[PDB]
Amino acid sequence: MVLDPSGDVLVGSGSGEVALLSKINLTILKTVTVQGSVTGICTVPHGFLVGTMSSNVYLVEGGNFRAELRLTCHSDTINDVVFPEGLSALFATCCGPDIRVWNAASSAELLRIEIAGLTCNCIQFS
Amino acid sequence: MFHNSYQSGFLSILYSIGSRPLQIWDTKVRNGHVKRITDEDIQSSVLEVVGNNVSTCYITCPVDPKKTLGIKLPFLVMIIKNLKRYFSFEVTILDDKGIRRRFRASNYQTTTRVKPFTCTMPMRLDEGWNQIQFNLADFTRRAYGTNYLETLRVQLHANCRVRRLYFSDRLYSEEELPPEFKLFL
Amino acid sequence: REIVCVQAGQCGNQIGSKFWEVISDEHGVDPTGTYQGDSDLQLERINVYFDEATGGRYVPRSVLIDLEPGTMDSVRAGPYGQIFRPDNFIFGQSGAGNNWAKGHYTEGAELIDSVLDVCCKEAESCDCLQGFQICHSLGGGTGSGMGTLLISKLREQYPDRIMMTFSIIPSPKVSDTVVEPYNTTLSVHQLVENSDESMCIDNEALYDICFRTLKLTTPTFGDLNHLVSAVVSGVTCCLRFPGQLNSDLRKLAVNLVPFPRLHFFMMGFAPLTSRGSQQYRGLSVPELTQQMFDAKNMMQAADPRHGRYLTASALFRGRMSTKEVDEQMLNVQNKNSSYFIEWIPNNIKSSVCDIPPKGLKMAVTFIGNNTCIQEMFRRVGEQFTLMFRRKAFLHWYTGEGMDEMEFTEAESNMNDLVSEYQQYQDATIE
Amino acid sequence: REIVCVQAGQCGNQIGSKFWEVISDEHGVDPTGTYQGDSDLQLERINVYFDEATGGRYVPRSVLIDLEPGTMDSVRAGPYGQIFRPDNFIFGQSGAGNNWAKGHYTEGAELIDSVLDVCCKEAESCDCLQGFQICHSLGGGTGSGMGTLLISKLREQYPDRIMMTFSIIPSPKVSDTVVEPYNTTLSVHQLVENSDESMCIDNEALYDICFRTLKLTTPTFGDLNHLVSAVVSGVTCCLRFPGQLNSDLRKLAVNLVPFPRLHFFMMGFAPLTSRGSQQYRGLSVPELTQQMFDAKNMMQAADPRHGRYLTASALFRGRMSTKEVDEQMLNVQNKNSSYFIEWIPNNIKSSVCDIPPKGLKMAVTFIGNNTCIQEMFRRVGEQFTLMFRRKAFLHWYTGEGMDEMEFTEAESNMNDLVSEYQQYQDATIE
Amino acid sequence: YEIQPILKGTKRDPATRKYNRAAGKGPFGAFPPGYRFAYKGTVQRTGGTTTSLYKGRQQHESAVAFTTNGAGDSKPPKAGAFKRRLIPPTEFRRYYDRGDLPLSVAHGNRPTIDWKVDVERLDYHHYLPIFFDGIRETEEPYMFLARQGCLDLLKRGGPKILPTIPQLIIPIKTALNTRHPEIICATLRILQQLIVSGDLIGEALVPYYRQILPMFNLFKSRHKNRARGDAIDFGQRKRDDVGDLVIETLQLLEVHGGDDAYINIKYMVPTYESCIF
Amino acid sequence: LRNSHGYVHKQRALDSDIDLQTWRRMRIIEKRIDVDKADPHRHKLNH
Amino acid sequence: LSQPVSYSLLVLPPKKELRKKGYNMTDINTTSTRVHPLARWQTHVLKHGATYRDALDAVEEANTKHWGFLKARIQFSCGSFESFVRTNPNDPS
Ligand SMILES: Nc1nc2c(ncn2[C@@H]2O[C@H](COP(=O)(O)OP(=O)(O)O)[C@@H](O)[C@H]2O)c(=O)[nH]1
């Protein structure tokens, strides 16, 4: 629950949907769906920020409410980290049901493996 | 579809009682409606297909037009109540010569006609609830002089209340039917 | 295929006089009755409106009825008045008093037998009888009451023929008579049951046609009756001349009326244009179609922009191409598609006739069935309800003998007609 | 490839009457509208300025707008007035009073929708539309306000066509109106954003043409408007007749405008000569070129010797060789090299058309883009600053409703235009 | 600043206030009295840069229905055939508020009228048209007392109902013209009760199809069955479906009408098909 | 100025106010805007 | 200050027609500023209330609408424009 500069009220739901409600009669005006349960709404001069339970942070624009994602983090005890043999630009980590591969130079991530309801314990590269 | 199934005794594909009665049926409805309503005479749920245009509103089986039922039983039995308005239905069969043929019946047809793709024929419905027993083998032999192998499409048009559609391998008396197939007033 | 005309009341007799002038001119008949025409096409269908007398003379199959002879003496003195058969003028000895009940019950039943005798004598002489044509005003007294009485009797005696009426209806802005709502309501009640086709004209629309389009400085009733005679003579043109696509009154009824009560139509006639402007624009099918659908040139107070067209008909006179007619009627239907009823795939019927009205290279008459006519009935019902709730002038009608329940029946029937038009305007495919 | 003309205000309507007389004469159209020409070459491109009416008539693609009908009534009563379509005259009920704010905001917005409706009806009738051509004065009231309003609306509605204007501008020596600086400054501010190419004329320059070159003892506005009609009909001559080197308004614009703000041009027409002198000089391309560049024959008060030519265009009419045209344009560029901008290798475009105007063996019209036009804007900006510091006559404009910020913006934009011309005049390669 | 609740479809609806102005008061009557041309910058500067990639943005304004350019996206205004109309004042409210009626309401889980006198002795000429006039009401206790009283009078009437038929047409027609679906349902149910309550009543109602049946045509297609396909409706007990009610009422009318009710119903509603032949 | 079938005659009308040039104008215009090369009902004219 | 008034689009014909004419599907990526011989310009008109945001949304809609699209142009009322191109050809997003 965060109030906008105009006076309207923002909302965040457990399903991951973010709506904007009017201060006069509480009717939906705009809506966006993001992944993960929303816990935390911020205010920026050019837009809004949304933080989720799955450690995802989105940036949305107040003009017409389109969402983009710039953050990827784990949310539980990290179990293992390894490097490939002969390569150092990337490394892989395991945490809960997820396996992720990062870029060491820019702290980005391009890979994801998810098996819901399980826990990964140890990873190794061939 | 039913090509690999066990086919003996009674095979029924429609029943008003159930979570999804129209699971394996497709609906093409304009200027009309389809719904399940409680009947006054028999005190049970029935499906209703009512529309202003007889040709446009109907329900087909199977859903995919490229599929075939593949049922080899000779008889087809319907449970239809007459609402004192137009009604019709179609059955498409296959013969041992390998020709797909149609059998259309309605209560507005002026003359019986045989053509190489269609036989059109008249029908009456008595007052109240009716059971219609249809002999595909006899009608095929009488119309085309050719043996009967299987049916591969069933259609139903407005307007008529329906409870159950099933096939049978022969005629059965009133007391020989299992309780779930016999209707009670 | 011959029509018999009946003209009733002052308005009917004057419009009839102008109509018979226009028709006698079109077939080249001298006011003495002698044929002086210049083509065999004129003579070959003269039977449709004229009976043959022994010498050179021809006589027109029309009955003139009125309750005071003043109008008949004026029309007999008119320029074509001599052509009418003397025995065809029927008149009484006291007026209608501008009262519908008097015109329907007291002098109507007294005179009607002589009118029915003349109408039967004229009808039974025909080898094959086509529909009757009646001209009258709805706001008057003998026109409304005796016209609807005679229409009811003719519908009893000839129910399989056609009954066609041209009717004058009260303007929305200025009344010519105080008791107009009663006479109009009772007359519409009679017409919706008895008539097959009824055309309605507002004198206000003819004044606006004359002033805006013809720019006449001082128009007179002769001009209004000429516009009416032009449309009346246009509807019958395909019955009596050759053409590329023949048409008939029954074919117009079959194509225009979707349901039997919806038979009230609006009218317009296209090649109206001032002598100054005529040098700047030649006649052509696009120009006629554009003027023909412009609401400025339509003879009813209701405007098409508030309703939707169920059906329309255009009758073209002249030697012209069918391609231009078909493509223009398609183009107009496509560009304004929201104003045409969607459950009919094409609402306009066309017809083409070879012989134009004299002095014009081409002409078209337009007949339209539009739901905006509901506004006129609603307005008349409102004024009727204002007067009836207060018994404003009812004692005259009750003194003639009418029961008050007739007024409530006529009001209810008109209200149901308005409801039926409103329901078909807002219908949808679903 | 047809052009639509717009004539606004007294000056515009009067110049337009003479223009349509000259064009009707060249294509042999009688003042009744009948073609009476003497060669098929006249008919095959008549569409460029005339629309085709149905019978034997032609109608001119022009819209006439004015706030009081006095001028329109004088031109309609004139000898060629009948040719104009009656529906094309748009007028109000009270004058502009030579006030820009009244002409732009109160009666402008009242009539502009009807003017745009007429312009759209004329434009959408064309099979392919070329640019618009507008004639008006900048010092007046309805000419400036409604002309610039209409120009802005047409640029919103037709941004891909060409916008060309002929404009009358205040003389440097004698004023015709006390409030000319405000109207001129606001109009030039509107034009430099909206226009693609604009020609400017001083009445004082036409007086010098009449007194020095033609030596007329008693000239009249018909002579000045004939000189203007001659140049305007000459620029478009290659659009509507065959020739050895075709040219077009868009091609002229592409060759004349180096940068979008530098679109103000000077005009001249060559075979002007007094009745006594014609026996002393035969026509030839060198004589036309010498008159073409003589400042005595230029229709603006600014003189070329204080500026430099960025570009120029010459359109020749007559039967002539391309070698003399090309070599004359080379010789003039080489001999006067200091007056031509050095970073452009060739400043003159030539065009040749086979058919001269009747009675002349040869003719040329000259269009010039010269930086000396900055001094005229500087003079107008100076007089504007003198008037504004003292709020001269300001209550009329402020009482209509204008914000003073409009005046400061228009002055600042015009001052930046004079600075931009001055910077490109003194630019160098370095 | 201030808030405005949606306040729609609730206990306090201003929608029901506009219709039936006579409602809203207490068991007794009303209480006694005392209780210019600002500069906006240079919007466009496209002059001198004309190009073929530009095209017009304004394109005049609006459109005339029958002009040369066309109607564009303009649509005609709706007539409002289904728009709710005001409820005319009723004589039932007058005679109940006055106290001249032989009845009272006996509360309970199944409501019932208690009658202060035996029904069979009533003058039905004076009562039956007054009870049918009360069907139009939409406020308690009037709806209950009127409709249940109508049913009770019809059920116990006997041979005296038949001469009353000419006087019942106006209340029946005025109830249907209100275009309130619940009033239509109540009127249709009472008509079904009336048709079978006696003998030779169906033949008497044949000449009056001109006044009753016009409202049947408008509402024969309206359905509350918004369920998708084979889903059942559990509100069937309420009998709030207009289309089924009007269809079954038409079939009951044809069957009890007599020799030539078909041609009249077929002249009123066009899509009807003969039940008997 | 016209016959029954709608054509513009050949010779000058008696006591006509228009001049010869406009008569020729009307004749050539009408011949231009005809749809057929001749009247299909010539044989039914009498004089 | 200025507001958008129109947006311009450059597209290629459908894939089957391009194959029918005989031009190769690949080899469309190049470092030169020139365009394919079959690319056609089309333009559309924005409404009065349009801003930069919804114009860019319409451009993205056109990008995801159909295959054969890498060029874009948004035109303002001041005569200026900016172009949008795909960083990687034949690859959306
Ligand atoms: N168009 C037209 N209307 C007429 C004419 N004469 C009368 N009316 C109208 O008809 C109404 C009068 O009806 P009238 O004919 O006198 O009724 P009557 O007394 O029964 O004959 C008024 O609205 C008049 O304006 C006429 O010649 N032409």
Ligand SMILES: Nc1nc2c(ncn2[C@@H]2O[C@H](COP(=O)(O)OP(=O)(O)O)[C@@H](O)[C@H]2O)c(=O)[nH]1
């Ligand atoms: N060359 C020329 N100038 C004219 C003509 N008529 C008026 N003017 C000039 O235009 C200015 C007056 O503008 P005017 O047309 O009256 O403005 P308006 O009142 O808005 O129409 C003065 O400088 C006049 O000298 C004309 O026929 N020819």
